[PDB]
Amino acid sequence: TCPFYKKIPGTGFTVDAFQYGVVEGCTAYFLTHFHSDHYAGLSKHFTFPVYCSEITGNLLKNKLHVQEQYIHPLPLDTECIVNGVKVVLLDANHCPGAVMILFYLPNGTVILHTGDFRADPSMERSLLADQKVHMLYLDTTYCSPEYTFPSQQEVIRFAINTAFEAVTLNPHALVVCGTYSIGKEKVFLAIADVLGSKVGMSQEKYKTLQCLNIPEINSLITTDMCSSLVHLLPMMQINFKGLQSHLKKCGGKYNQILAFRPTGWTHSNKFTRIADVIPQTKGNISIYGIPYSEHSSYLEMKRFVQWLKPQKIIPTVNVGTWKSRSTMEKYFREWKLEAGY
Ligand code: NI
């Protein structure tokens, strides 16, 4: 059964609630983004209205075969009426097509559901600036002060400089980047751009990328692995055994692998700066774990909430243990006392 924190009071709406069968009283199902923990349950046999971004709707149609007549794509930054309720979709700074949803309830209450997001000051100048929000349904993935990580720009600088150095020293080195879902495309696209290569990948992953409206993409990606020196592999194959096996398949074109695993946070964040990151190495194979996050750090989250000043916060992540819930509630109270709302 659907949990309370996926239901929008005063409406017929749910958010990211496709794995519960027919939800009692639900007239429209919203989907914030195309990640499996959120879309779990959708298929060609779904016959209720799904409301989402254009990019998310491309992925539903092409990857899950949802029928077109039930996909309702909405433009961003635009007031729309859904089953008699005004809604706005805003960029979530997560993966491609990911949104936050503003609901303007018939009684005057305004609710923001962040979906999954990486808070940024640029959000303080969207349509959020223009009215008060009463309730916030918050992505609390990294809601603890130990969670610090660098900007995306510093992480990409590190990756480009690392790859360009390695391949310029050894033109027979292959670069490999791990993936298991959409998101974090800048990692492999920025590396291919500095090297003058396309990114090579499976037909299934090329298909997924072609649903994303990324400009000039036919220019950056390919299924011809032989023409590419940046390859994308499943995240599970980014280990010494999996990479040795891949290098065998390349027929003596290459004699070294430099591989990247974009994780979110790992505890080596509490001690080491991005500048100081080193790989794990075995023979002619090196593997870099890089802290490329598409969720808010603790400080970015705190700043957003202290700017927004909601009356009530409903966490959507880490809600299954009493220790996590108590921790989060304690930080929400601190933020409110420090800022004065
Ligand atoms: Ni996500």
DSSP 88-137: EEEE-SSSTT-EEEEEE-TTS-EEEE--S----GGGGGSGGGGS--SEEE
CATH code of 148-295, in short, is 3.40.50.12650
Maximum C-alpha span of the chain: 68
Strand partners, 32: none
* 10-39 burial code (b ≥16 CB/10 A, e <16): ebbbbbbbbeeeebeebebbbbbbbbeebb
User: Which candidate, 286, 284, 283, 244, places its Cα nearest to that of 261?
Assistant: 286
**Cα of 183 to ligand 1 centre, how many Å?**
8
Domain ranges of the chain: 1-147+296-341, 148-295
Experimental method: X-ray
Cα–Cα dist 290/156, whole Å: 9
User: Which candidate, 289, 89, 264, places its Cα nearest to that of 181?
Assistant: 264
**Cα of 98 to ligand 1 centre, how many Å?**
8
**Cα of 284 to ligand 1 centre, how many Å?**
34
User: Which candidate, 142, 136, 145, 144, places its Cα nearest to that of 315?
Assistant: 136
Burial of 8 (0-12, 13-18, 19+ CB in 10 A): buried
**Cα of 297 to ligand 1 centre, how many Å?**
15
Dihedral sign, Cα of residue 20, residue 236, residue 248, residue 170: positive
115, 33 Cβ separation under 8 angstroms: yes
**Cα of 63 to ligand 1 centre, how many Å?**
17
* 274-303 burial code (b ≥16 CB/10 A, e <16): beebeeeeeeebbbbbbbbbbbbbbebbbb
220, 189 Cβ separation under 8 angstroms: yes
**What is the token pair recorded at 117?**
């997001």
**Cα of 33 to ligand 1 centre, how many Å?**
7
User: Which candidate, 310, 294, 18, places its Cα nearest to that of 141?
Assistant: 294
**How is residue 23 annotated by DSSP?**
P
**What is the token pair recorded at 70?**
């039930």
Cα–Cα dist 321/323, whole Å: 5
Please give the CATH topology (third level) of the domain spanning 1-147+296-341. Metallo-beta-lactamase; Chain A (3.60.15)
Matching fold, domains 1-147+296-341 and 148-295 = no
**Cα of 116 to ligand 1 centre, how many Å?**
5
List CB contacts of 29: < 8 A, sequence separation 6 or more.
Answer: 13, 14, 17, 18, 23, 48, 49, 50, 51
**Cα of 214 to ligand 1 centre, how many Å?**
19
**Cα of 131 to ligand 1 centre, how many Å?**
27
**How is residue 219 annotated by DSSP?**
G
